């Protein structure tokens, strides 16, 4: 819980608990007992809804796909949906198992093949690569059930890189890849339908659990432009004769006059 | 058979529930957890760090 | 609700399973079991009684 408020009478002190220093890079400890006359207040609120586990552990949407010919593919990443990508880009390193739930409006009999990294996925339905011996697969009938399965932390390091300030190839190389793109791939999910019944919309809800965030950061203050790319200059009109005009798309509203708001 | 009943709220997917799920990739051993400095446990600890206010946000 | 899961093999009728079934006609009292001579418990006990072989089974 949060601490209670202590009483505070009139104080005439020579050590001001108000005059701090912003330059020292430390925040002030000034509680309202230092500025005014407080009363004892049994305060029992908790920030239990703010800890990383309950903050991120809510099973948001990570990606949508569309079964074209009873087949669709999705490479696991949080980079497509800005709302959850921002909550992740709060922190630098994150370590979490994830719990994938598939909300599909299809009807019939579907199959999900979690392709671990480094192998070839089925390039279409009724491919030979679907008969797999070791690639873990999930069968389900969308009516009567939502398929769900946990992927443990597949990291190749002690955490996930939300931001990576490095490359993967040495200096003189030519196809160097900035960012977190090479640092990790979580495989991919290949969906197919064995029947013909339902729609084609598949939503992948992923819930980070057993989270352990590592380095806080300034939350993203600009709308994204690409994935894995942390650009923010939006090039809105590529066709017209202004393509070289780059919007900014921030969220700082302006007020008409200071000292009047 | 032991008599069970399925009350309302028992074939649904609520995004903010707390359930256990079958581990795909069993036997999987995650890489060890090393000491990275700076671990955070609560976002309010971010909300307690001073940050500048855009006080002159005029047009 | 207690979390239960229905694995594969849990809405099926396998002829050679071993389950309990609800007794229609409850309170029914079967007639008493009297001592009839000759009770058998195992068909191999039949397979241990000598029986003639049709050794001259020509057309």
């Amino acid at each position: 819980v949060v601490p209670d408020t202590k009483p505070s009478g009139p104080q005439h002190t020579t050590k001001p608990s108000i005059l701090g220093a912003m330059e020292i890079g430390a925040s002030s400890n000034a509680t309202p007992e230092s500025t005014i006359e407080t009363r004892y207040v049994y305060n029992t609120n908790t920030n239990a809804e703010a800890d990383v586990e309950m903050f991120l552990g809510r099973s948001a949407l990570w990606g949508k796909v569309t079964l074209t010919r009873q087949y669709a593919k999705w490479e696991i990443n949080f980079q497509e949906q800005a709302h959850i990508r921002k909550k992740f880009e709060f922190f630098t390193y994150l370590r979490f198992d994830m719990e994938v739930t598939i909300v599909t409006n299809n009807k019939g009999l579907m199959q999900i093949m979690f392709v671990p990294p480094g192998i070839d996925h089925p390039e279409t339905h009724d491919d030979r690569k679907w008969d797999s011996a070791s690639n873990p697969s999930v069968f389900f009938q969308p009516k009567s059930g939502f398929p769900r399965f946990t992927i443990p932390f597949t990291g190749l390091a002690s955490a996930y890189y939300m931001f990576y300030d490095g490359y993967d190839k040495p200096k003189g190389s030519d196809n160097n890849e900035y960012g977190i793109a090479p640092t990790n791939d979580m495989g991919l999910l290949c969906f197919r339908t064995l029947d013909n019944s339902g729609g084609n919309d598949v939503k992948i809800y992923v819930k980070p659990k057993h989270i352990t965030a590592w380095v806080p950061r300034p939350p993203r203050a600009t709308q994204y432009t690409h994935k894995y790319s942390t650009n923010y200059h939006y090039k809105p009109n590529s066709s017209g004769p202004d393509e070289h005009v780059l919007k900014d798309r921030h969220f700082i509203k302006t007020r008409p006059l200071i000292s009047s708001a | 058979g032991l008599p069970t009943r399925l009350p309302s709220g028992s074939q649904q997917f609520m995004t903010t529930e707390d359930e256990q799920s079958p581990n795909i990739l069993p036997g999987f051993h995650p890489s060890k957890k090393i000491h990275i400095p700076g671990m955070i446990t609560n976002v309010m600890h971010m909300a307690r760090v001073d940050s500048f206010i855009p006080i002159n946000n005029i047009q | 609700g207690l979390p239960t899961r229905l694995p594969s093999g849990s809405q099926q009728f396998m002829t050679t399973e071993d389950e309990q079934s609800p007794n229609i006609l409850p309170g029914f009292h079967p007639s008493k079991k009297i001592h009839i001579p000759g009770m058998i418990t195992n068909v191999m006990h039949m397979a241990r009684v000598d029986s003639f072989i049709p050794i001259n089974n020509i057309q």
């Binding site: 020292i24 430390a26 | 707390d18 609560n42 | 979390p3």
Partner: peptide, 25 residues
């Protein structure tokens, strides 16, 4: 506190602010 899948990664959700706000020597 039962774990129905007999595995750690299958469990549900698990459970000092001076590292920031005072990182002085």
């Amino acid at each position: 506190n039962i774990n129905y899948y007999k595995d750690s990664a299958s469990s549900g959700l698990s459970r000092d602010p001076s590292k920031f706000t005072q990182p002085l020597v």
